[PDB]
Amino acid sequence: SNRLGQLVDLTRLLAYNYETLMACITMNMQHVQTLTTEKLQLTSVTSLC
Amino acid sequence: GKYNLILSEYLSFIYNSQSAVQIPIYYSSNSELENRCIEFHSKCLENSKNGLSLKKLFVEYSDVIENATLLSILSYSYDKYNAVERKLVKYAKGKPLEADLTVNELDYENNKITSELFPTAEEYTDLLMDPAILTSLSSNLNAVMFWLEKHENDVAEKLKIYKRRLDLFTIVASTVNKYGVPRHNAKYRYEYEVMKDKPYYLVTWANSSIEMLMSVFSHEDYLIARELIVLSYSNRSTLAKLVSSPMSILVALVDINGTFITNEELELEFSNKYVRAIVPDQTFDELKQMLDNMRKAGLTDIPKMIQDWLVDCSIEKFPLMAKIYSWSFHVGFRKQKMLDAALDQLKTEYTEDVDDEMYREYTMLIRDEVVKMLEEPVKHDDHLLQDSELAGLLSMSSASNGESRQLKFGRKTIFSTKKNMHVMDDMANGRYTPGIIPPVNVDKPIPLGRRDVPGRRTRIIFILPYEYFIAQHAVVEKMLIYAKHTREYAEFYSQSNQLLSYGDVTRFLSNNSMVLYTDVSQWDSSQHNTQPFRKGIIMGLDMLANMTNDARVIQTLNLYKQTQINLMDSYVQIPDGNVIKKIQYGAVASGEKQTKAANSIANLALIKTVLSRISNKYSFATKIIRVDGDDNYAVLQFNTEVTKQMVQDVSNDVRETYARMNTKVKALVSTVGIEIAKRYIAGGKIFFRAGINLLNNEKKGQSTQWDQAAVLYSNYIVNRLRGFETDREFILTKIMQMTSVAITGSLRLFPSERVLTTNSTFKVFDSEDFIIEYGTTDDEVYIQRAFMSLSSQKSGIADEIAASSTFKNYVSRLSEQLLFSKNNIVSRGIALTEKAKLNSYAPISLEKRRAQISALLTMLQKPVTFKSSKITINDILRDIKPFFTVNEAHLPIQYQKFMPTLPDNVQYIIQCIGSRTYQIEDDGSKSAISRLISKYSVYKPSIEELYKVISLHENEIQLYLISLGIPKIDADTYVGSKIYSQDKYRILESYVYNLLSINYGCYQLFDFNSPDLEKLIRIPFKGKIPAVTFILHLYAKLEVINHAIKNGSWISLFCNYPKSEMIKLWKKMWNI
Amino acid sequence: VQYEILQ
Amino acid sequence: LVSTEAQIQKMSQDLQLEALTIQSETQFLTGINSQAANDCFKTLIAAMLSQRTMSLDFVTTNYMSLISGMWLLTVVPNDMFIRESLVACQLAIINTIIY
Amino acid sequence: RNLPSTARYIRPNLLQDRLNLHDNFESLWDTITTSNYILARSVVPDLKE
RNA sequence: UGUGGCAGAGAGCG
RNA sequence: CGCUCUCUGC
């Protein structure tokens, strides 16, 4: 709750870099549930947030 | 009652001469038989002193042979020099052995001739191979040869033992006879002039080889012994270190089927849990390289046993490994040089490539841990912080070794290293100045001591001044006494047993979790124990200083802080010939009041800091971390099931995450097992390291020929329980040879079993191993009353030191820091207490003990004395015993084995009653009065003094309490309450509770709260005498257990103890 | 009287 | 980035992991470090760009991880997360925090 | 992991007791019941605290 | 008269 | 509770 503006900032930054790297793509970015799957430790997300 | 027969045979064998005569001396508690013993003695001496045949009288006095008790045997035999060779030539018909100088890295660590390394005797030193024991190799050889001679006609498995040990002893005696036997001087040293033409490391090799071959009972034992004895003659640096290293991996291969657990509340509780062994693949490649080094060093049979064992990985063949793990440390010590042993540690690689995110967290965790330790006393303004100076001056350990110094007490000169005596000296000359901490710099570097231990490096010891201790004392005592209410330390997990020191290897084990265990013993010179560690503690001290308002506490804390400041830059005196080296070493080691807990803290912070990096790649919940100084293990549980690749990758991540801090490590991950220096668990079963050299020691103590027999027997008992078994007859032979005393060149005396096995200050062993013995008879009572009369002795050196000016001054200066209205109650008390730690000074103890032995000998020669009624324990047991009644019982087997290496009788007991449900009676002076004084002071007045003080009026008691800082109102309340009659009774209850006879090595492990043992002990209850019924039930348990140990079978008991004897015994209870 | 030094 | 030790201070002292004790606890603020923030920063963007489905792997006792996961689920869509781990995370959130 | 439709799996035969060993095969049922008891002992938790 | 310790626990002496 | 020994982390 007291990281409010920092997470606003994070969300804008993340989305910005996502869209600006999306622009440098040439193949259709299509949605599929793949066989294997990247792991993601939420502790890393807590480290970021 | 068998020792004496082996004694007789030993005497007959060693001397063998017409001139060699044998003279018993006896005793009896019965007047008539005693006077007939006196007669017998007289007539025997006379007949000996008249060149008459002695063999005639031995029939006439048959009564002494049937009813009297032996003491000793004298021996008149002349010099007869060089008899060892004259016996030994026959057992040496094999070929002698050749060394190989190109094996060890160094030059002097090879077993080459002395003259090729020490041409001058002035530069000779036996300290690199000193056995450090007052018994010769020739003694050991004589014992071995006598054993071999008596076992020359047996035809059984015993003969297979005899052939095996004969081949081994042939290899040894072939090696010795190539040159000869070194001859001991009066001090049991071996001078240059005997070793000049012989290998330098022949003696230690000989002694260690004797110890090994005396511990051979099977074929595999013979293989191990022949394969170590022939390589320990040359290799002396890469043998115990080598073979003892793979074991740490092997524990990660043993499937658990049946387990023992421990609670947080510290109680065993078995589990049928099965756990697999998820070992990665690359550690096998590591293990193979270790075996390749093993073969490359010259080992053939023992790699074969370790490789063919892995085909099954069974736990029934596994004790062999443990056996092997103990056969490595019975080869001797690697007593190398002070210089190169320091330089094993003083090689440093400090780098400007580590993190800063790690060190800052590390520093903070140390800070936080310090604050958790010190929040309560720093805040509530405890006396021990206020009075830290006086606290340290009382707790000065009187072996402490700060800086050898030339003293003078009146008309003497002393070269003591002990800091108590130094303080006594410095008080007089105005130099005592504990607030001004000395530097440790170029102007005053530090000395060193050397800690050796086989299979590992030689570790180093700081030898500091006496101000550092005083500064560190109070804070470290509060730290310990806090954190033994808390996890993560050995002070919380320690009394004796399983359910203790570890007690959580085996709760959080399954196929979900893993455990990472890691040896951190080289991490003293590391880059993470320098600056951040010290600055973290300094920061914590700043916080704590701002968390108090009183000024003495701030001074003490600022002094501890400044100690850490000065220790941050620290040089080290080491001579080398003429010049002196001093090396920059700004890091941590022992030789300090702080080292244990502080190292535990730093390792805790380190592992907590590292463990927040595995979280970047795994999800786990840390269930437990444990730290005991220089070792560490952490268990961790997962969201899923464990694999081989996750263990491997976790291990690599651990190694590299330590590498990011410039920190070496052998990362070891497992699922069932761990390994540390002293012990390990496999398959839910605790084994131990049995590496205590008997016939070779670390250093030169101060004890006599006598007491070394007792230490050697204690180490034998330990090693036997641990697993390493030596032939008990050999141990008894050594005990007789070490208690033998030379009254002249040709007169020699030999005591008996009934002098060495009696509870006193002269006890050496027990008639039946794993069982202390007491006395129901007249005769043990008789000699115990006699020897207790003699234990109290004097030391003129101590008398003159205690009569000098510095001792009086020291007591006065201790006194004057407190109130000034008691002068004949405590000053004498503090002097009497300091006397208890002047005896640490070796010449005092030697004077007293040599005097004590002389007093013993002046009643071993001539007849015996009644000693005038002085009461002891066996007097009581004599009266308790005749109202017991035995009956044959039969207990079943319902308890699980979890210490396989024990003997089968002890294990049979464990396999019929339980292992420990632990109990407490007093955690130190609990009762009424010392926990007040320990709140307003630290002083620890002896319970003798309290038992007297309470008997005095309530006025000078009131004065005495007010003199110890206490106010008047609490004294008034204490007198009004009428608690002094209660604390007479509590103190006498504490006196009976001082009986420590529950923990000698086999009673250490047994559960006396069992229901199965208890249903046998059918002693009815009377009430209102708790001490007696307590001790009666306890003693009956000891009876049952000792009969079980010595005979296997079980018995019940019954004691309809008369009320009359309760009361008759009650007054002897609370005395002595 | 004599000394040696390392850093 | 923020200095880690500050966050360690305020988190450890106000959550007060030490004084719960009703386990053989041995609690500690498992990973909060740097070289994970940027790991996440790469992971999220690269997975959304590549349309690489990514899963979650956590321990529900560390409720802070879920308190950060709810932010994640807020900003990052839900069809990017494999359904089983997403459902598990949401279910841990509901059964632990909300209800 | 998401598992494809290319995958397969074999189902165990969990058909209940066709023999009724709890009807006068007491020597076998004693062993069976003992076996399942001792298995269950290896998974009941230890009273850790 | 030439010197090798800190603290934990278990024995033996006050 | 003061000292020697056993090992213990050193």
Tokens encoding B525: 């010179």
Query: In whole angstroms, what is the distance from residue E16 CA to residue E13 CA?
Result: 9
Q: Which nucleotide C1' is nearest B839 CA?
A: G3
Other residues' Cβ atoms within 10 Å of the Cβ of residue B805? 11
Q: How far apart are the first and last CA of chain A?
A: 11
How far: B916 CA to G4 C1' (Å)?
A: 29
Q: Which nucleotide C1' is nearest B520 CA?
A: G9
Q: Where are the alpha helices (DSSP H) in B660-724?
A: 705-722
Name residue, tokens 């991996």. B249
Torsions phi, psi of B308, nearest 5? Answer: -75, -15
Collapsed DSSP state (helix, strand, coil) of residue B899: coil
Distance of residue B373 Cα from the nearest chain D Cα, in angstroms: 13
Q: Is the Cβ of B619 closer than 8 Å to some Cβ of chain A?
A: yes
Do β-strands B448-451 and B674-675 pair in parallel, antiparallel, or remain unpaired?
Answer: unpaired
- Spell out which chain D residues touch chain B, with contact meaning CB-CB distance below 8 angstroms: 3-5, 8-9, 12, 18, 23-24, 26-36, 39, 57-59, 61-62
Collapsed DSSP state (helix, strand, coil) of residue B112: coil
C-alpha atoms less than 13 angstroms from C-alpha of B1038 in its C-beta half-sphere: 20
Burial of B662 (0-12, 13-18, 19+ CB in 10 A): middle
The alpha carbon of B606 is separated from its chain's Cα centroid by a whole number of angstroms, namely: 30
- The residues in A 1-49 lying below 8 A from D, measured between CB atoms, are 7, 11, 14-15, 17-18, 21-22, 25, 29-34, 37-49
The alpha carbon of B136 is separated from its chain's Cα centroid by a whole number of angstroms, namely: 24
Do β-strands B21-27 and B69-76 pair in parallel, antiparallel, or remain unpaired?
Answer: antiparallel
Other residues' Cβ atoms within 10 Å of the Cβ of residue B791? 12
Closest residue, by C-alpha, to the C1' of F9:
B495
Q: Is the CB of B430 under 7 A from strand G?
A: no
Query: In whole angstroms, what is the distance from residue B936 CA to residue B919 CA?
Result: 29
Count residue pairs from B and D with Cβ separation < 8 A: 64
Name residue, tokens 């080491």. B574
Are B423 and B466 spatial neighbours (Cβ–Cβ below 8 Å)? yes
Mark the nucleotides of strand G covered by protein, meaning any atom under 7 Å from a CB: 1-10
Of B261, B254, B251, B247, whose CA–CA distance to B276 is shortest?
A: B254
Cβ within 8 Å of residue B948, ≥6 positions away = none
Angle, CA of B932, B936 and B940, to the nearest 5°: 65
Q: Is the Cβ of E48 closer than 8 Å to some Cβ of chain D?
A: yes
Q: Is the Cβ of A39 closer than 8 Å to some Cβ of chain E?
A: no
Torsions phi, psi of B305, nearest 5? Answer: -65, -35
Q: Does domain B337-396+438-489+520-594 have CATH number 1.10.357.80?
A: yes
Helix H or strand E encompassing B504: none
E neighbour chains, 3+ CB pairs within 8 Å? A, B, D
Please say whether the dihedral angle defined by the alpha carbons of residues D83, D84, D85 and D88, taken in this order, is positive or negative: positive
Tokens encoding D53: 């489905």
C6/B582 touch (CB, cutoff 8 Å), yes or no: yes
**Chain A residues close to B618, C-beta within 8 Å:** 41
Distance of residue E6 Cα from the nearest chain B Cα, in angstroms: 25
DSSP 8-state symbol, D14: I
Q: Strands of B887-888's sheet, edge to edge?
A: B887-888, B1051-1054, B1017-1018
Please say whether the dihedral angle defined by the alpha carbons of residues B424, B426, B430 and B436, taken in this order, is positive or negative: negative
Other residues' Cβ atoms within 10 Å of the Cβ of residue B898? 21
Of D81, E6, D90, D62, whose CA–CA distance to A38 is shortest?
A: D81
Are B535 and B363 spatial neighbours (Cβ–Cβ below 8 Å)? yes
Q: Which of residues 278-317 of B touch strand G (CB under 7 A)?
A: none
Return the CATH fold of B236-253+279-336. Answer: Arc Repressor Mutant, subunit A (1.10.10)
Distance of residue C4 Cα from the nearest chain B Cα, in angstroms: 5
Query: In whole angstroms, what is the distance from residue B90 CA to residue B104 CA?
Result: 33
Count residue pairs from A and E with Cβ separation < 8 A: 9
Q: What is the CATH number of domain B254-278+490-519+595-696?
A: 3.30.70.2480
Name residue, tokens 């003892």. B244
Are B418 and B841 spatial neighbours (Cβ–Cβ below 8 Å)? yes
E46/B271 touch (CB, cutoff 8 Å), yes or no: yes
Name residue, tokens 């387990």. B259
Query: In whole angstroms, what is the distance from residue B94 CA to residue B167 CA?
Result: 9
Tokens encoding B1026: 């708790």
DSSP 8-state symbol, B457: P
Our CA dihedral for B798, B802, B804, B806, rounded to 10 degrees, sits at: 120
Other residues' Cβ atoms within 10 Å of the Cβ of residue B26? 23
Query: In whole angstroms, what is the distance from residue B967 CA to residue B972 CA?
Result: 9
Query: In whole angstroms, what is the distance from residue B11 CA to residue B733 CA?
Result: 11
B921-1006 matches B83-235 in CATH topology: yes
Query: In whole angstroms, what is the distance from residue D2 CA to residue B360 CA?
Result: 13
**Chain B residues close to E34, C-beta within 8 Å:** none
Length of chain C counted residue by residue: 7
Tokens encoding B66: 């049937």
Query: In whole angstroms, what is the distance from residue B272 CA to residue B528 CA?
Result: 42
Q: How far apart are the first and last CA of chain B?
A: 30
Do β-strands B620-627 and C4-5 pair in parallel, antiparallel, or remain unpaired?
Answer: unpaired
Burial of E19 (0-12, 13-18, 19+ CB in 10 A): exposed
How far: B387 CA to G2 C1' (Å)?
A: 20
Are B467 and B402 spatial neighbours (Cβ–Cβ below 8 Å)? no
Q: Does domain B921-1006 have CATH number 1.20.120.1400?
A: yes
Length of chain B counted residue by residue: 1072
Q: How was this structure determined?
A: cryo-EM
| Cα Rg of chain E, angstroms | 18
Query: In whole angstroms, what is the distance from residue B919 CA to residue B993 CA?
Result: 13
B412 Rama sector, left if φ>0, alpha if ψ -120 to 50, beta otherwise: beta
How far: B683 CA to F14 C1' (Å)?
A: 46
Angle, CA of B890, B895 and B899, to the nearest 5°: 120
Mark the nucleotides of strand F covered by protein, meaning any atom under 7 Å from a CB: 1-14
Cβ within 8 Å of residue B416, ≥6 positions away = B404, B405, B407, B422, B841
Per-residue three-class SS string for B736-752 = HHHHCEECCCCEEEEEC
Tokens encoding B646: 């996750």
The alpha carbon of A26 is separated from its chain's Cα centroid by a whole number of angstroms, namely: 20
Are B306 and B321 spatial neighbours (Cβ–Cβ below 8 Å)? yes
Q: What is the CATH number of domain B83-235?
A: 1.20.120.1390
Q: Is the Cβ of A32 closer than 8 Å to some Cβ of chain E?
A: no
Of B229, B122, B116, B119, whose CA–CA distance to B167 is shortest?
A: B229
Query: In whole angstroms, what is the distance from residue B415 CA to residue B407 CA?
Result: 6
Are B237 and B340 spatial neighbours (Cβ–Cβ below 8 Å)? no
Per-residue three-class SS string for B1001-1030 = CCCCCECCCCHHHHHHEECCCCCCCHHHHH
Do β-strands B513-519 and B69-76 pair in parallel, antiparallel, or remain unpaired?
Answer: unpaired
Q: What is the DSSP string of B230-253?
A: TTTTT--SSSHHHHTSTHHHHGGG
Of B607, B605, B599, B610, whose CA–CA distance to B633 is shortest?
A: B607
Q: Is the CB of B524 under 7 A from strand G?
A: yes
Per-residue three-class SS string for D29-56 = CCCCCCCCHHHHHHHHHHHHHHCCCECC
Q: Is the CB of B495 under 7 A from strand G?
A: no
Per-residue three-class SS string for B371-427 = HHHHHHHHHHCCHHHHCHHHHHHHCCCCCCCCCCCCECCCCCCECCCCHHHHHHHHH
Our CA dihedral for B56, B58, B60, B62, rounded to 10 degrees, sits at: -160
Q: Identify which of D57, D66, D79 has the shortest CB distance to residue A41.
A: D57
Are B68 and B782 spatial neighbours (Cβ–Cβ below 8 Å)? no
Tokens encoding B417: 């290293």
Domain definitions of chain B by residue range: 1-82+697-765, 83-235, 236-253+279-336, 254-278+490-519+595-696, 337-396+438-489+520-594, 397-437+766-867, 868-920+1007-1072, 921-1006
Query: In whole angstroms, what is the distance from residue B937 CA to residue B933 CA?
Result: 5
Name residue, tokens 């320690």. B494
Return the CATH fold of B868-920+1007-1072. Answer: Ribosomal Protein S5; domain 2 (3.30.230)
Indicate contact of A with B: 3+ CB pairs under 8 A: yes
